[PDB]
Here is the input.
Amino acid sequence: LPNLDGLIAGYARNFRPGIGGPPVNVALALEVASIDHISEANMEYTMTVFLHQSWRDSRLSYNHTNETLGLDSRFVDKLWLPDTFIVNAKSAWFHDVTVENKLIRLQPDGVILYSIRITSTVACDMDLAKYPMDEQECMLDLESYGYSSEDIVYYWSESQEHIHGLDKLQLAQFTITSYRFTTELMNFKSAGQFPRLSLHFHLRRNRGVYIIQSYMPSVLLVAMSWVSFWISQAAVPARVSLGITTVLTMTTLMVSARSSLPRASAIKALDVYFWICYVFVFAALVEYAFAHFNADADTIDIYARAVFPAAFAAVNVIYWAAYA
Amino acid sequence: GNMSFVKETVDKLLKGYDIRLRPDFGGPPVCVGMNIDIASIDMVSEVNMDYTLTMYFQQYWRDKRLAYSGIPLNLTLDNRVADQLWVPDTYFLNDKKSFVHGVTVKNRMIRLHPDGTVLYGLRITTTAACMMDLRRYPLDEQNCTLEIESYGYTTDDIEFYWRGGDKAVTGVERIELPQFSIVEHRLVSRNVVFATGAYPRLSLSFRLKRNIGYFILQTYMPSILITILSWVSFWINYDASAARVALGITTVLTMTTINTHLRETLPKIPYVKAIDMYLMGCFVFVFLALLEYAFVNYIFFAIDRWSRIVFPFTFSLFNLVYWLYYV
Amino acid sequence: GNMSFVKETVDKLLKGYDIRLRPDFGGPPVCVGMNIDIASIDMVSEVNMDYTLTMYFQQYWRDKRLAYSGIPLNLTLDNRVADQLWVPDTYFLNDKKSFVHGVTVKNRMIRLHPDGTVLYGLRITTTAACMMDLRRYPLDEQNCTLEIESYGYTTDDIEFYWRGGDKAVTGVERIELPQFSIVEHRLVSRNVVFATGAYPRLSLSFRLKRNIGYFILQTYMPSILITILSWVSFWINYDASAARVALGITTVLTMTTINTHLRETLPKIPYVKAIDMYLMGCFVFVFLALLEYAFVNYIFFAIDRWSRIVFPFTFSLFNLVYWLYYV
Amino acid sequence: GNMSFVKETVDKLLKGYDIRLRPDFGGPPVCVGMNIDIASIDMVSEVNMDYTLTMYFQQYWRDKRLAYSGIPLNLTLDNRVADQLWVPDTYFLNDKKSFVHGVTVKNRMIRLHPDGTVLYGLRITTTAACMMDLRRYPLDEQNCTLEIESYGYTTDDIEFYWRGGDKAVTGVERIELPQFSIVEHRLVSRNVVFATGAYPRLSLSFRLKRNIGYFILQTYMPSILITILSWVSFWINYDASAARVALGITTVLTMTTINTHLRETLPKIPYVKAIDMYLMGCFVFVFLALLEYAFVNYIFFAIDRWSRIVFPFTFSLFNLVYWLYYV
Amino acid sequence: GNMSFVKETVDKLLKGYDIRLRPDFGGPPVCVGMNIDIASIDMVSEVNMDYTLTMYFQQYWRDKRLAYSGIPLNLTLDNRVADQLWVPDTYFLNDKKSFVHGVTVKNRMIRLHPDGTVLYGLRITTTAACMMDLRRYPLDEQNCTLEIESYGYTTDDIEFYWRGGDKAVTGVERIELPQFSIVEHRLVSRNVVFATGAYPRLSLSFRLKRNIGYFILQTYMPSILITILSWVSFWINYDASAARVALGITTVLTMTTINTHLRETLPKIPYVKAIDMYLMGCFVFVFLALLEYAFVNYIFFAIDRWSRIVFPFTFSLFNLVYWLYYV
Amino acid sequence: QVQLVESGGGLVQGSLRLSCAASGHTFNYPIMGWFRQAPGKEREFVGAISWSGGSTSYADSVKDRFTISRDNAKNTVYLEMNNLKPEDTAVYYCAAKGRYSGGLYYPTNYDYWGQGTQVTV
Amino acid sequence: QVQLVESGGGLVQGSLRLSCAASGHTFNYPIMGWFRQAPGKEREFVGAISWSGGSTSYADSVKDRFTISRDNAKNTVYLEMNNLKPEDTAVYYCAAKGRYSGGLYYPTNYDYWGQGTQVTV
Amino acid sequence: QVQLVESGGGLVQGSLRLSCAASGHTFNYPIMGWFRQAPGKEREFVGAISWSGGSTSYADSVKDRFTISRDNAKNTVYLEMNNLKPEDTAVYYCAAKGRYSGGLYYPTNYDYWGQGTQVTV
Ligand SMILES: *[C@@H]1O[C@H](CO)[C@@H](O[C@@H]2O[C@H](CO)[C@@H](O)[C@H](O)[C@H]2NC(C)=O)[C@H](O)[C@H]1NC(C)=O
Ligand SMILES: NCCc1c[nH]cn1
Ligand SMILES: NCCc1c[nH]cn1
Ligand SMILES: NCCc1c[nH]cn1
Here is the structure.
């Protein structure tokens, strides 16, 4: 208690330690708790992380005590803190239930340990060229907002590689293949040089029944159009109905799929496959109309039988190989 | 005129009180007893894999700095006095968004005791993440937990225990989930070790069993009726090419629409759900039925009778295998 | 120059005032009178089983510490003076999300009286949970309650009563729900006992009757028209295989689409609603109609006349049984 | 060096100032002049029966305690000085959710005057409820109001008036509603009496006329085209049973889909809207058209020519009656 | 030991500092230089007619009260010191909802200078309204502006200018809109006069050009394919009444579904969009195609060959006129 | 703009049914109230009812004796007075109230009033 | 308004199964409780169960000996008493509790009660 | 960029109808105003109207005498001056205002102006 009163009284909150001198060296560590949402439509992901910041402040060094002074979140407002902000965060907030989840542990030599739990919605630029067989890389940039490299210098702590916890994360749709901690000291903004600690992790979309939902109904519509080939040409309403219904269902699927996806003017691989499927179903109706016009035959229909799956099998192999 | 005497006693307690220091700072850890009075579980979201919980969170601990004598009563003070008192830094590890109700005032209770015991109650609405295994969906059983842990103080400074043993958590019967039933709840006390240190942990877990009544009417029954509808084409004469072809197409298209609707209500998980298996099986039968007439039409330009017995028998066999496997 | 005299009087009242201590602390409980002036009920959500309520919540109690003499007037002070005064810890037990309006200032009123009576009013918009029984939906009747209770002070320290008897709650006629009508409202006073102690409880309940006008046009009428549409196939000649088969299929498919839309607007309850029973019955008639032609087609490769009288008669009988049972 | 002199003057004004007491406390009521500078009306929601309004709310009143001499200037102080000054407890009675913008600082203005006049401006975005009569929808005309009232002070303590008469509210021309047009706005001053007392009231009302251009293309035109599409079956030969039956069915099914979409965008009101009447009438014509062929098919196993003139004539007559009634 | 000397200097500056008074109060207006560092434009919503903007808003002004000597350095103070300093009341006139990020601390920067220059930076995410002209949609070009203005201080007390001329706003190249491209940005400085007075105004405007790539695939291509699909009926023999009638109906129904989907994604504007004109034209061709067979069927109970050349030629002519007009 | 006409008074020694017909912008005034004014005494609130929902309120003096109901087809609000007593000797008025005009019991909150019917027992 | 009737008591020296039939607005009272009152002693909580979900609670004295289950078809809640002991000599009551009426263990929180069945061993 | 041309003035002793044709980016300037400037006197606001919605405002001097309406087909705003008085002897101008340019009554808030028409009575 006597230490706490003495330290605050002679403490100047508005100034970084050693102002007008060497920059403050701040050790930074991350403990990712979870990655809740990954929305391609909003180009964002939500992450909950324990942010640990360590720095030395000689103004808070005490004597005669060799025990670290664990302190509550109330003591936070009494001390100078780094102005670390997430560069690419759309929105973020602190958990305050039941109290502000802030940790301050003070050591006799003046080393301060500052840990807070934060949930942040971070914007991630995603390329949907190979969607859904696409791998995305998302960053997490940390930087001082007001203090340049002359005042605050950031660096990953030695314990970062052991407490990141990215291996333990479980994602419903993606999988964390690789992660990397990058330090960029060359973020020269207008105010000055700003050191930027960045966390890069690569996300691979799971290829399971999700892609089966998108592709199989499209394939089955194409297969349904092939049924008209085995149907007799004299059954004009039967083959016409099969042609029109398959084409309409394919058209609705293409429109619905894009609508339930971001409005980006990007040629997604799913859209390409839909176009290929639409050509086959449309051509089948054209083929029967050509056959009916000629009648106004059976060998032509048999020739159309072997060609369409053979062409469809070949185009599927090219499609899957290109995007895999 | 005891109010003045009580005011003097309370002012004496808070004179020199340091909220920055825990009780018995530098000595034995302070034991905190916790009880939960569950109010309701508002929502259980499979897409977001989380549930909303409203409860009365109460903390019990003894602070000798607040001990008073001469007043044989339990002082129930205003909730605003908690700002001048030390409280445990209790937080929920698996929560996603939580808040404390503040109408008409903050839902907070402080009740001191002559021996120094402090009662701290909060009405908290929390959204806690709960990973769900949807392999057996909708016939699945889920285990959602609520992790309680201190944030700053390690096991050397604070300890957590369920006050009252297995009776610490009450109000479980108040939970009325239209889609789930509370099979069982458990109380777990453990110590979790991190890089900073070892922290006390209290875990409250519920085992939820999903109700199949809604899904039978919503999904299973329409799929069966469509499959039976495709069988009608067998009794239709083969010369009616337009009718039988239309019957096969419409059943296939309807099956796709049902399949699309179900998967939109669920998260984009890669593995195949139990309900997905049933829909895929139903799609096979209707697709084969349309292929059956194509074979009949091709040979024509007896088979229908053979199909009239195989398809209902195979579908009945498929249903028996499906239900027994998942029950 | 009475403003200076009033200022001296008010400063005298607040000098030595302890907000942490309730009036008559350690003595008889303080009686709090409560009146509610309902503004409107914005929404009634069946999916979330809750309703949004806006009201003027007013509390009446006497604090002898605030009694003043020499001023024969009721001092209407600024709303910011409430922070220096003790107020009851009144909270709503069944609320889900509530707030106090703060434009252009906090919607709060303080009005002292010479005898020490204090009037405390708040304009509160609250979302209170209301479990609904949808077995008779949409012909159901709902009873939504609003629970009012003290959080920290037990019955030994505070008491709640409806000020004015049955006239405590006003503005019920202002409620304009497009889907519901306020049949009746009741005021209930009771004591609820918890582990911590017994707490006073005030309950305000409304009995809501759903309006059937919207659902007749939205759901019932389209289902009837589809069922009548299927009967047209009976008058069509049996040789028109394509036409009659198409008529049966489209009616069945349309019935499924109507059924899917209705259930999406309602929570995933396991039990069967009254509207679900009607939709299932309509689906049976159209499905039997398509099966009727399949039997006709099979025997052909009189029955239609016998179907022309049975189906309209059976459907009329089904409607009479359905409506009488639920009315 | 007048800044020091101004600082001394301002500190003198705030020395002994009591924010808890209104100007001329215990004497004549203080008159408050109010002007509104409308910025925009963001949304007008029929489902929620409310509109979003952004405006510059300015209040004018005189406080002799803030009168200063020797400075022939209007002191434009920082917005943070309003916390040390008494302000009227003005609130909006019919609002649902309102807030004051705070970027980059709170959108607040304080401008004192030598005679004691105080100007208080706020940029407020408010969502005010507005009950709508949808009987004539979409050809309806709506009257949405904005109620302004004091919360705590009665007419004996405060009075409200529109500063500038009918010119108090400006910026009405800035309102650009894609679906509505501001026909007229009115300013109403009245006193409303409650149980607590009589309170001054200021009302601002707009009469909104809905634009029919969107609904003609969205709803009316597709319905007419479907009705005309059903008439094509009359020219088709009776022997084409499959074609004429398919034409009648598809038009009926399409009419149902259009009807379902419209009602989903509107609140579940029990009464029948004008647009609903048109959709019901269109459904009758297409349903009769399919029934017309059923009669033709029945008698066959001239009528078409009679139907070719009755249906277009009756539908044209129906349109003429419908439009004249609602215009 | 310069930290103590710096602390003494800073305390001297804030001793007697009055935040309520602007620099050079009662004298010449204080010039404020503003530069914007755009981070990104998250969304551009046509339905709400607004865009979301994230930027680094920096303000430059000189306050002689904060001038210090003896320290040849720029003091970068904590962001919490801004509460004890006067800052301009800068607000955005056309914003709808804005906030300042506060993780891990408030995104605020204060950097004093020896001559009294003060640098004030904020990271602000704002939603600014932007009225859009959708007559040429989706081939339209939009001009969205960001209005910057002082709220309380008039031109006699404060002046705004773009610091650095046309280089004041940077980061325009960072904007990555999937649907729009930043054609040009402009900086405008003007004075706007209101009833209270004349206020300085800074305007930042972007001209956005919509990308047509998405809409060609989403809307234009499906409509063309349906129109081509209707032409297939011409080659089909006239005796196939069921097939040709079904072909005409399904194309018409599909065209309606496409039209409904497009208009749901756009605000209910009364005027006709360019995309609406194309959809209406496509609907005419398919409707005429079905009417074409009705004429053929009527005369039968050569025309098809004439239709095989007129319809593709007319549709090609319609496309050429449509694209040239809107490009 | 709402016009109110009331009829069905007269003199009796009994059960009487008053009536009130409304016309105009009834939507803006969904609440109809009944008031009586004894000679010399201030106008007294009798009962109020909403056009939609049929919710009604009554004064203590006329509670369990007077019933108020309305039919939207005729836009008519009718007051049924049963067990008439000599205290019920006053002119009965028909009034309409705005949506946000405040409490029912205060006549000054009502905008449009009827001419009045004389009932004497 | 819920009516509670209980039966199945009698005197034994054993296993006994009590029963309780409910009728009325059961939805408003989804919790059913069992109470016993020894002569002179205060009424004692035995066990409680919800109508929906089958969640149940028991007292320490009757734990692992008494089982409570209900069937919604008959609207009946039945208490199965096994390994009866002389301590189980009291009148057994059936009670219903409101949704927001508080804890189960307190009889005063229950609104509707049964007449009572006498069980003596 | 909006170009404004006005015509229809002349000298009369009466009713006169001014007109103003606009061309360019009219969407950015949805408000059209009318101003007159007496010799020696400052320019005076007459009336303003929006392109969409037809909402209009007038000065007190010209209230109930001058009517302003526009047609979007011709992109023309016309001022109808009736009951002309000798006070109405000034050059009449046509102006356009931006969406966020402030109040109507202040000419300095308008960006584009017409050449001017002389009306003398
Ligand atoms: C301070 O503000 C007041 C109120 O706006 C000003 O008084 C007005 O002055 C104008 C002329 O500038 C007159 O047309 C108004 O009639 C005045 N109103 C009142 C109520 O007196 C005053 O001029 C302003 N002071 C300064 C120095 O600008
Ligand atoms: N006032 C509610 C106190 C409580 C609820 N649960 C336990 N204690
Ligand atoms: N200012 C309105 C206060 C009120 C409403 N209801 C009762 N009192
Ligand atoms: N600073 C602009 C203040 C304002 C807008 N409207 C009226 N006054």
